[PDB]
Paper text:
[name] (EC 2.1.1.45) catalyzes the dUMP methylation reaction, involving N5,10-methylenetetrahydrofolate (meTHF)-aided concerted transfer and reduction of the one-carbon group, its products being thymidylate and dihydrofolate (DHF). N4-hydroxy-2′-deoxycytidine 5′-monophosphate (N4-OH-[name]) is a substrate analog, reported to inhibit the enzyme from bacterial, avian and mammalian sources, as well as from certain helminths. Inhibition was found to be competitive with respect to dUMP, and apparently mechanism-based, as it showed meTHF- and time-dependence; the dependence on time pointed to the slow-binding inhibition. Novel evidence is presented allowing further clarification of the mechanism of the slow-binding [name] (TS) inhibition by N4-hydroxy-[name] (N4-OH-[name]).
The crystal structure of the mouse TS-N4-OH-[name] complex soaked with N5,10-methylenetetrahydrofolate revealed the reaction to run via a unique imidazolidine ring opening, leaving the one-carbon group bound to the N(10) atom, thus too distant from the pyrimidine C(5) atom to enable the electrophilic attack and methylene group transfer. The structure of mTS-N4-OH-[name] complex soaked with meTHF was obtained by soaking crystals of the initial complex with approximately 50 mM solution of meTHF for a few hours. Electron density corresponding to the inhibitor and the cofactor is clearly defined in both subunits. The folate derivative is modeled with 0.88 and 0.85 occupancies for subunits A and B, respectively. The N4-OH-[name] molecules are situated too far away from Cys189 to form covalent bonds (the distances are 3.07 Å and 2.95 Å in subunits A and B, respectively). In particular, the resolution is insufficient to unequivocally judge the oxidation levels of the pteridine ring and one-carbon group of the folate derivative (PDB ligand code: TGQ), even if scrutinized electron density maps allow leaning towards tetrahydrofolate (with the pteridine ring C(6) sp3 hybridization) and methylene group (suggested as one resulting from the imidazolidine ring opening), respectively. Of note, however, is the fact that the cofactor molecule is present in a modified form, with electron density next to the N(10) atom, suggesting the one-carbon group to be covalently bound to N(10) instead N(5). Thus the imidazolidine ring must have been apparently opened in an unusual manner, on the N(5) rather than N(10) side. Analysis of residues remaining in a close proximity to TGQ shows that the one-carbon group is orientated toward the inhibitor N(4) atom, separated from it by the distances of 3.43 Å and 3.34 Å in the subunits A and B, respectively. Thus, with N4-OH-[name] bound in the active site the imidazolidine ring opens at the N(5) site, in a striking contrast to the corresponding phenomenon observed with dUMP and FdUMP, the difference resulting apparently from the presence of the N4-OH residue.
Residue numbers in the entry:
A (entry chain B), B (entry chain A): 21 to 307
Amino acid sequence: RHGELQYLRQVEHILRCGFKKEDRTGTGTLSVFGMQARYSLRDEFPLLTTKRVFWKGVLEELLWFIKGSTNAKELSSKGVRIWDANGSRDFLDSLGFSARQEGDLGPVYGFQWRHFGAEYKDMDSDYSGQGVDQLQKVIDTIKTNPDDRRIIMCAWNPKDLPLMALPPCHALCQFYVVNGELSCQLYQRSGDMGLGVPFNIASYALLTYMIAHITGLQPGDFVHTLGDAHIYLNHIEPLKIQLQREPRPFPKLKILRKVETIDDFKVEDFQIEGYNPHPTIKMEMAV
Amino acid sequence: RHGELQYLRQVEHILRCGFKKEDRTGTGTLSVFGMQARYSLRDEFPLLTTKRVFWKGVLEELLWFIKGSTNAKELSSKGVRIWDANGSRDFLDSLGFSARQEGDLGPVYGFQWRHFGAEYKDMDSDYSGQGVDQLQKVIDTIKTNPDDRRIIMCAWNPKDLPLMALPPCHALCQFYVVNGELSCQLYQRSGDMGLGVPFNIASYALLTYMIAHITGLQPGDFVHTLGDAHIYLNHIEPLKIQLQREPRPFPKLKILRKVETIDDFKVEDFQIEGYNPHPTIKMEMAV
Ligand SMILES: CN(C[C@H]1CNc2[nH]c(N)nc(=O)c2N1)c1ccc(C(=O)N[C@@H](CCC(=O)O)C(=O)O)cc1
Ligand SMILES: CN(C[C@H]1CNc2[nH]c(N)nc(=O)c2N1)c1ccc(C(=O)N[C@@H](CCC(=O)O)C(=O)O)cc1
Ligand SMILES: O=c1nc(NO)ccn1[C@H]1C[C@H](O)[C@@H](COP(=O)(O)O)O1
Ligand SMILES: O=c1nc(NO)ccn1[C@H]1C[C@H](O)[C@@H](COP(=O)(O)O)O1
């Protein structure tokens, strides 16, 4: 069965059985608490086909995470503005971060992934050798003890939450190895089904491909687990259109060079093959 | 429609479709990565009936968590020995904790729930006002902003892992409110289907009941999410006996007085009603 039907059944389930629920943005949602889907990574890549996904944004964002950046400007210069609103002067001031330079998202993914527990100052501070490099520790463990049931990268950092422009939606992920296959499970505390979720699925599918390549393993499964899975009210019509389209076979992901360390990946090393999505569907971002 | 069928279906799924997988204890397992079940908390309590669950241990352990204890002795004195091995002189030394008193589990659940980010010294240290009191913060947010999609309690603390006798199996949990009902999702990175999982299900169902009480809400769902869900090889025959038993209706949990703060709950304030499970099934703990 086509993996994308799981995403579609979830959207359908929220539309039929979800409850109306207010939210921080004042937009309102239809919401379900607790969902799980499994996307095979074996000779296919779960880039959704019922709408075109901004794949370039996914790849640049992840490389930006990996090099430890929490500066939206360093991502916007690549032509990816998905974090620009959250780092804007007006939104930062909206949370009391008046002394903060524009673009500074606070101690979010890049900082927690490479520097968990270090003392956060500025997005451009030097943090070399500070905190826990969870990304490299996950990589080292997969190589030396693939049976380990503790292979976790955690972005949720209660001590640092008050400094984040947006507390991470992807609280943590866990990796798992059996039969030479590398699987990943993401715990997403909050999922915008129309905008973020398709993006996030591709993001962690890519991360698994990158780490599988670095560790000499094959991609297995990506398990997507949701807390508050919601459809914003102004996404109902677009998503009702999207459910009527039929999915096309998932594209493939090719890695064009042999890479030795996670840090050496560059955009040019990746190529999506056979991606024939339905047209884009515009959906406004609740801020 | 009996909630326990979900647990029995998962055990069956691992027995049928799980993979052989080596593990830290050297026992070996049949393993599946990524599972989810939903246990209703509405006028029933998911204490499994196809074998007797050690309800006293569930209750004492949670009260021991809530008051912030990391002292296995303080639990063993109540006649609950589930953590004694992990605090034993020999197991501590097996991890290099030669200077530590017996019973000192390190910065595990109780400390992370009440003092996340504090500098751990010994089990007996005074930590009042140090670190983030995630437990009380969860309660405060549920009362003042029940729509919040960030109601999380996280025990996974990458900076403290090297000090823990056992890194937590319950990495984090999230709370959710809709329609006057309080729900909880547990992310459990590793699940011993035979021993811990039935216990753990009761534990977070109980935690949800306690918080629903102090927040003036009704219990909703407990969503149980597993990473490495496994059956130890020496639990297969015991579990195959359990799978042939048919569930009895779940008991009820009563809270016998109005309690105002999570810290004021006491063992005597709880009563399990109508619990007549099938006989106990002996299953050795892989250590
Ligand atoms: C992960 N992420 C970061 C967070 C930031 N805030 C936010 N707020 C809300 N309420 N829902 C969300 O999910 C997100 N996502 C994304 C943000 C925006 C997009 C996005 O804007 N996608 C467009 C394309 C944009 C473009 O092409 O430049 C689309 O596919 O329709 C994608 C991810
Ligand atoms: C959550 N938990 C803590 C962890 C500790 N280590 C561990 N190791 C393994 N490999 N599987 C597990 O799951 C657990 N569980 C429990 C630990 C032990 C038990 C237990 O076995 N108690 C006995 C004594 C009680 C009595 O006799 O009445 C019993 O249930 O019969 C139950 C939960
Ligand atoms: O779905 C999302 N994926 C993200 N990846 O980085 C980031 C955000 N979101 C969604 C989740 C919420 O709809 C919203 C975050 O708001 P919050 O749950 O109140 O924190 O954006
Ligand atoms: O299922 C469990 N529930 C627990 N609650 O506190 C604690 C432990 N376990 C199980 C999971 C593993 O079989 C084992 C822990 O070993 P580890 O996953 O290698 O850390 O005990």
